[PDB]
Design a protein around this ligand. Sequence first.
Ligand SMILES: CCCCCCCCCCCCCCCCCC(=O)OC[C@H](COP(=O)([O-])OCC(O)COP(=O)([O-])OC[C@@H](COC(=O)CCCCCCCCCCCCCCCCC)OC(=O)CCCCCCCCCCCCCCCCC)OC(=O)CCCCCCCCCCCCCCCCC
Ligand SMILES: CCCCCCCCCCCCCCCCCC(=O)OC[C@H](COP(=O)([O-])OCC(O)COP(=O)([O-])OC[C@@H](COC(=O)CCCCCCCCCCCCCCCCC)OC(=O)CCCCCCCCCCCCCCCCC)OC(=O)CCCCCCCCCCCCCCCCC
Ligand SMILES: CCCCCCCCCCCCCCCCCC(=O)OC[C@H](COP(=O)([O-])OCC(O)COP(=O)([O-])OC[C@@H](COC(=O)CCCCCCCCCCCCCCCCC)OC(=O)CCCCCCCCCCCCCCCCC)OC(=O)CCCCCCCCCCCCCCCCC
Ligand SMILES: CCCCCCCCCCCCCCCCCC(=O)OC[C@H](COP(=O)([O-])OCC(O)COP(=O)([O-])OC[C@@H](COC(=O)CCCCCCCCCCCCCCCCC)OC(=O)CCCCCCCCCCCCCCCCC)OC(=O)CCCCCCCCCCCCCCCCC
Ligand SMILES: CCCCCCCCCCCCCCCCCC(=O)OC[C@H](COP(=O)([O-])OCC(O)COP(=O)([O-])OC[C@@H](COC(=O)CCCCCCCCCCCCCCCCC)OC(=O)CCCCCCCCCCCCCCCCC)OC(=O)CCCCCCCCCCCCCCCCC
Ligand SMILES: CCCCCCCCCCCCCCCCCC(=O)OC[C@H](COP(=O)([O-])OCC[N+](C)(C)C)OC(=O)CCCCCCCCCCCCCCCCC
Ligand SMILES: COC1=C(OC)C(=O)C(C/C=C(\C)CC/C=C(\C)CC/C=C(\C)CC/C=C(\C)CC/C=C(\C)CC/C=C(/C)CC/C=C(\C)CCC=C(C)C)=C(C)C1=O
Lengths: 50, 58, 161, 140, 106, 200, 108, 41, 231, 74
Amino acid sequence: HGWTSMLSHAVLLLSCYSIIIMFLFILGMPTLLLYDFGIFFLAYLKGAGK
Amino acid sequence: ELEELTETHNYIPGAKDDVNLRGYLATQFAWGKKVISFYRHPADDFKCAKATKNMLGR
Amino acid sequence: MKKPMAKAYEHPYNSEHHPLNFSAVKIAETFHDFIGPEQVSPHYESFAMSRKFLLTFWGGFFVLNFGMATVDLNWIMKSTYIPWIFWFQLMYFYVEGKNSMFMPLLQRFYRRAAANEIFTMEAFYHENIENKLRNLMRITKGQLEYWDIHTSYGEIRADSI
Amino acid sequence: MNPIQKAWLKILEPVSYVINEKMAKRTGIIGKLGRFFAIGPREYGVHPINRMFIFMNRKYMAFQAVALHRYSFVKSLTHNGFHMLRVFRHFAFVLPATVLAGLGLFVYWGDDNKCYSPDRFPYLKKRAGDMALPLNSLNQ
Amino acid sequence: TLQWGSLAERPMVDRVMSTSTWPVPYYQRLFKAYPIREKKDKMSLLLSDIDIDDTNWYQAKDFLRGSFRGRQIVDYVENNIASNTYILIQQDVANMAKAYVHDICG
Amino acid sequence: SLHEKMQTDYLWVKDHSQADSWAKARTHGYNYIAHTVPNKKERYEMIWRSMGKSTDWELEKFRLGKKFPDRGNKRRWFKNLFRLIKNPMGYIFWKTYKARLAKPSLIVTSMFIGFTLGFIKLKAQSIAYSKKQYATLRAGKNIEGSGQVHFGYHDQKWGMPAIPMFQLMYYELPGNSIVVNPCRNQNYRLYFEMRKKLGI
Amino acid sequence: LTQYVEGQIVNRNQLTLKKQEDIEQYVLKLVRGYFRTTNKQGLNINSVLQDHGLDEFDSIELAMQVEEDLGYVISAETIPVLNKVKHFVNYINHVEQFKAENGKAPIA
Amino acid sequence: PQLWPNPNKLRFADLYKYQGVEMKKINDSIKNYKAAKFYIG
Amino acid sequence: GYKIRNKSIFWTRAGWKNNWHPKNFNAPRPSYGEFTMGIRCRNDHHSFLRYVQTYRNMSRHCKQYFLGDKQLEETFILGLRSLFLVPYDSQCLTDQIKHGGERRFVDQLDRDFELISYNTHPYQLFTYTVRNEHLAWKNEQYEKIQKGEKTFEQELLDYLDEQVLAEKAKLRDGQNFSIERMTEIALHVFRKARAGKVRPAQDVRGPDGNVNDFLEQRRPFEHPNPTGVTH
Amino acid sequence: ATALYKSSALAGNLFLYAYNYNNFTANIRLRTMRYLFPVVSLAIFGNIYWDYRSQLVKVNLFDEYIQARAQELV
Ligand SMILES: CCCCCCCCCCCCCCCCCC(=O)OC[C@H](COP(=O)([O-])OCC(O)COP(=O)([O-])OC[C@@H](COC(=O)CCCCCCCCCCCCCCCCC)OC(=O)CCCCCCCCCCCCCCCCC)OC(=O)CCCCCCCCCCCCCCCCC
Ligand SMILES: CCCCCCCCCCCCCCCCCC(=O)OC[C@H](COP(=O)([O-])OCC(O)COP(=O)([O-])OC[C@@H](COC(=O)CCCCCCCCCCCCCCCCC)OC(=O)CCCCCCCCCCCCCCCCC)OC(=O)CCCCCCCCCCCCCCCCC
Ligand SMILES: CCCCCCCCCCCCCCCCCC(=O)OC[C@H](COP(=O)([O-])OCC(O)COP(=O)([O-])OC[C@@H](COC(=O)CCCCCCCCCCCCCCCCC)OC(=O)CCCCCCCCCCCCCCCCC)OC(=O)CCCCCCCCCCCCCCCCC
Ligand SMILES: CCCCCCCCCCCCCCCCCC(=O)OC[C@H](COP(=O)([O-])OCC(O)COP(=O)([O-])OC[C@@H](COC(=O)CCCCCCCCCCCCCCCCC)OC(=O)CCCCCCCCCCCCCCCCC)OC(=O)CCCCCCCCCCCCCCCCC
Ligand SMILES: CCCCCCCCCCCCCCCCCC(=O)OC[C@H](COP(=O)([O-])OCC(O)COP(=O)([O-])OC[C@@H](COC(=O)CCCCCCCCCCCCCCCCC)OC(=O)CCCCCCCCCCCCCCCCC)OC(=O)CCCCCCCCCCCCCCCCC
Ligand SMILES: CCCCCCCCCCCCCCCCCC(=O)OC[C@H](COP(=O)([O-])OCC[N+](C)(C)C)OC(=O)CCCCCCCCCCCCCCCCC
Ligand SMILES: COC1=C(OC)C(=O)C(C/C=C(\C)CC/C=C(\C)CC/C=C(\C)CC/C=C(\C)CC/C=C(\C)CC/C=C(/C)CC/C=C(\C)CCC=C(C)C)=C(C)C1=O
């Protein structure tokens, strides 16, 4: 992050935003995966009922 | 041909080369030694998913 | 001679200075127009060694210039102590310590060794391609031997009669 | 050679005649002085700032072509065209939106261009001759 | 060696001359200057070691049709030669020898 | 080609001196000598050979003759300065090509940029503190010495250590965030009421 | 309905065969005109295109030329089965018979 | 070949009507400026 | 010349020169009908007909801008086939590709045709430039032949015909005029003709080791100030 | 000065599009810029002209008030 020292008043501005970006899109990866499974998404996770 | 690789977004080096000799020279000591598969596009995704009677689709 | 076509299709949105499609080649051309040609020195000695005394003056002039201008230089030296200690102790192993301690981490060397071998393959490009052609020329010369036999049949048929 | 250089030539056409034909060959010092200020094609007349733009424009444009050329997030929702499982489809429009936001890079540069500067403290220091003021100067 | 001199005289040790001239210009040329992106009259160097293919007979017809004798050769080959390809490869003298025994009987 | 001579002259500068046109003034290489190169003694032998061929190995002719400086090196420092101003990045690029053939790691490059930009940042704050002292001086407080490293019985503030620990807890005061209170806009209520009273 | 021919715009004409002998003579002329066809005189009704230097892609170019001359719209499912001169003749008959009874062109 | 322009041995009228590779680039940029009249307008 | 010395240059974790099915952890595994509830897969059996239609589209949409040039159309066909014959002749086992090689190549060619339909594919722009440079040279020859003048190509052909007569009239001991001797006669004329033209310097170094550029002007300094334009 | 700079920077974007007109118009990889460049430019002009217009209205209200109020106090 050294090359961004003069781009703002915070040296870690890009790092502080990226940790939030990394959190939000990683949190959305499982959500989009269940959407891809469809209505059967529970059978993809646990399998058949008992 | 370099513009064709760029305009079709085939920006994985050596993907369309039958013998990616440059890819072998770069991975002579790489972990999990492998070269890119032939004509692999960086956007294609052939992942599947199935639901079985057991958990985790097993 | 039959009259050929006057011209082919002329694309209305493609030019040499503004090519429609992109590649590193056009960027490389504009880059060398910017940095200009290689600044070749015509002299017998390099510029630095011929003006060491003069460059030393101007080197110290700007040091004094910054030193005379910076009235709070001691505040900057003290403010730099903590990051100087921190970043050097943190990155010592990854830069230098790895060369004699736990792990070598030869990833960057592998990239030098492969490029050094490619430098040699490019230097011997003419040799390697010429050997590949010697085998293709051998195949071509072998096929041209059948025409040499046929051109003598007329002489053979005449002398046999 | 550019139209601005050719426009200078028509204006300096008589001056070039006096320097190149008369002064540049008379004798002695007048000859050396006329041959030094000779008029003609510019030696080392390339403009690096022009060339810096052409290079940076081309390199940044090749990046725009990559960031803007993405597979659609909307088209992948139905699982009927080219995309069955795309766990990072919600990232498809970040690069395009980021390049489009780069159009206001120079429009909104610095603090004065993002707000009404006279309501900010730094404007008071500039009108005071770039002088330090107490932080509550806008209130008093 | 690893001890070549001071830092200021580092660019000095690079030049190697093919003549006995003194003093020697120190600068070692890195690349060849390419001021104008001129389209070279030279043919492409990609056409180096490509095996025989369709472009060979297609261009042979184009150059043969520039002659009167070549126009007769092309027309007879494309009409009256029982071959499943234009990439003619002679691997035997069967068609040659049988054409001579059927001709020298006279 | 057709436009080669015109373009090559337009792109680069040539040497205008005719220093070597005069025969006897030409140097043998004894004006600017390389001292540390591994072939140093071969350079001196070629200089000696050049001096011997000029006098047919009767060096008494050289002792009696006039010795000249290297006129070809005249005004060389000015000529490099003008090329640096003409194209500063092109001059820096080619003068550092051989040095940039060896590229340090991403860590070393980041340390160079970080410490360099961090030093400039402290210099900018040091300049801003000098404006504070000038405002203090004009406000009626005479200043002995200078700087903010107080020798006496005062608190000092050294400046943010350029490490992520302090850069997460602290951040510098943004002057653009000090604003006029928005209650100023409520004075416009006086204008709206006056316009209605005057029948505007 | 017009196309460029050697840089000149020329009005293109369509053919209507509707007869077995006209179909065989057209197909033979079609295949003989293709620049990859070998042994043009040895080409008969029972000639396999593979025996004359033609592959699956050359059959597409031949079918593409049928749509130019006859005005057909041949689907991609039909092209890979046209591998003989006889196959082109029977297909043309099937298209004309289909249009004579169903009153419309075959599905494309 | 021997009539190619020389920056030293050049006439004033020839320099004014040179039209070299620098002008060829500009004329290409001008074609883009003109074609963008409706979009910018 | 130079050969790669590492004997393990083409070794991968999946085998020698394996660029069709690289080894990774998530390997393909079979599915059993009786135990599978539902599945999400994008594979299908449509690549064959899509491969046929793509060839027809690329061929027909490129011929729109050929202006009826028959030789260019036939040349383009040979080039188009070389693009579609890649999976049939490559060393890579295109039938053993990870997740279906047929689907991968069809989707790859569809990206090419999308550019072709817009007349923006680099192979198209390269074809127009190459053909324009070729027709300009053919038109130069046609204008010289209509004027009764002899083309530069005919002058060499006539000059080379008289060189063979002169060599075969003096070579009476042997009477086998090989193609090797015929070649070095033409190359000796080609080098002399190429050196006669005012061409830009192609080789880095001239007869000496020095470069042949405009920048390769060193001491001694013997050029005066640049002179201005003449009136 | 702020409204003039931002107007010149917006004019710089119009030159960047004009200088690269053939690539932005014919190359489909840049279609999103071709489509949404006029939308962003209108929003930029909207902000520039909004700030100038609102500033102009506030100055006129201030000028007309200090004149009316001064006469009442006289
Ligand atoms: C604070 C926020 C908290 C939440 C965080 C997350 C936010 C939510 C966003 C998540 C994504 C939501 C968007 C979903 C889009 C769906 C679009 C759609 O509808 O497509 C259809 C699609 C179904 O189609 P398909 O699966 O592709 O295939 C279907 C087959 O073809 C069909 O085969 P079939 O025909 O055999 O099936 C038969 C039928 C069978 O259906 C039945 O079961 C029948 C049920 C009984 C009906 C009543 C019967 C009454 C009987 C009456 C009898 C009368 C007769 C009496 C006698 C007659 C009298 C004369 O099945 C169906 O057809 C129904 C399927 C569709 C059901 C709808 C599912 C979506 C409902 C969502 C509701 C809430 C949405 C709010 C969102 C608001 C917007 C923001 O729906 C889905 O895919 C659902 C996917 C859901 C996955 C996402 C789950 C994410 C997990 C969320 C919880 C996470 C908790 C932990 C969070 C941790 C922190 C993050
Ligand atoms: C009256 C005037 C004359 C009318 C008649 C004439 C005009 C007729 C129409 C002419 C054409 C109109 C063009 C559009 C229709 C095109 C039809 C078509 O087939 O195109 C297919 C076309 C084909 O794809 P393509 O050509 O390959 O590429 C398309 C694009 O390049 C890009 O494709 P893409 O797929 O990559 O784009 C993806 C992007 C597309 O961009 C958008 O659409 C913006 C989406 C923003 C809204 C997202 C909604 C999220 C769920 C909300 C659920 C509740 C809704 C309630 C909303 C209340 C609002 C207060 O969306 C995303 O990025 C998805 C990820 C979003 C990030 C995560 C945010 C979601 C989570 C939020 C959580 C926070 C709240 C949690 C708690 C909630 C409270 C409890 O795809 C398109 O959709 C084209 C869109 C083009 C943009 C149109 C607008 C341009 C800007 C105009 C000014 C703004 C107007 C729109 C404002 C929208 C409100 C914000
Ligand atoms: C009665 C009423 C009238 C009273 C009059 C009283 C005054 C008498 C007038 C005449 C006085 C001189 C007598 C005749 C001398 C002739 C000697 C000769 O034959 O030529 C030798 C000398 C030989 O030069 P060269 O061989 O061609 O090349 C030099 C070497 O090759 C080296 O070239 P290089 O490339 O390696 O660069 C190194 C060079 C220079 O390189 C440098 O580093 C110097 C840098 C200076 C410029 C920078 C200054 C810093 C401040 C500004 C910053 C610039 C920023 C630019 C960049 C922007 C930011 C990035 O080193 C030198 O210093 C060379 C200077 C000459 C050698 C003398 C011994 C020098 C040691 C003393 C050094 C301290 C003085 C330095 C002054 C330098 C002026 C050129 O030529 C001259 O000195 C020419 C001077 C004659 C000019 C005549 C002008 C008309 C006279 C009347 C003027 C009226 C004035 C009224 C004043 C009123 C009272 C205040
Ligand atoms: C300086 C001496 C005292 C001054 C007296 C004057 C002495 C006369 C000589 C002065 C003239 C020359 C000055 C030195 C030049 C360096 C020598 C040289 O040329 O050798 C060739 C040298 C090649 O190195 P090599 O040894 O042949 O092979 C290296 C291998 O790659 C890999 O090698 P490795 O694996 O063995 O190790 C990796 C690394 C070795 O590891 C390191 O070098 C550690 C570097 C860590 C960062 C150090 C930051 C320095 C502090 C600057 C912060 C401001 C200073 C004030 C604040 C702190 C106060 C202490 O390699 C190197 O970097 C080699 C350089 C080591 C020696 C030079 C280090 C100088 C540091 C300064 C020392 C303290 C000065 C205090 C300031 C005094 C002011 C009053 O050229 C280089 O490329 C290295 C220079 C640094 C380049 C890094 C990349 C910079 C890219 C910047 C891009 C952004 C620019 C944007 C453009 C700007 C706008 C247009
Ligand atoms: C599916 C697989 C995963 C996906 C694969 C896809 C990845 C795509 C790769 C494509 C590569 C990027 C292409 C563009 C880059 C080209 C430009 C460039 O930077 O090359 C540098 C180029 C190559 O460097 P190199 O010397 O050859 O070394 C290469 C490698 O380091 C190798 O040399 P080494 O072996 O000797 O290195 C040893 C290594 C040894 O490291 C280790 O053994 C362990 C490392 C553990 C890290 C511990 C993290 C601790 C976190 C604590 C955080 C606390 C504070 C947090 C506060 C946040 C808020 C609370 O330690 C290092 O030195 C690493 C170097 C620095 C790494 C920085 C990023 C680290 C995280 C990477 C995230 C990616 C994760 C992927 C998942 C991988 C999972 C297996 O060298 C240059 O510097 C020249 C370029 C000038 C750059 C200067 C300015 C840089 C800023 C602009 C860069 C471009 C924009 C930003 C792009 C991303 C840069 C960070
Ligand atoms: C520098 C600035 C920019 C930084 C960008 C990042 C640069 C990263 C450089 C590439 C490194 C990538 C490492 C990948 C793993 C390589 C090793 C390997 O293949 O394992 C083989 C290994 C090793 O086998 P081997 O045979 O190859 O090596 C043997 C090792 N020796 C020689 C010592 C015996 O075998 C395995 O199969 C183990 C698999 C473990 C998987 C570990 C990686 C999991 C994470 C990867 C996915 C991350 C995606 C993140 C995307 C985030 C998006 C939001
Ligand atoms: C649209 O897509 C995009 C690109 O295209 C792909 C990009 O390239 C880029 C990258 C951007 C760039 C590469 C451009 C970078 C330029 C930057 C940072 C600023 C450039 C600044 C300069 C060149 C300095 C010039 C100095 C000044 C203007 C100050 C002095 C004033 C001057 C010279 C003008 C006087 C003022 C006037 C109003 C008169 C105007 C004069 C004229 C019009 C004369 C012209 C005469 C003729 C004959 C044409 C982006 C961001 C982008 O979004």
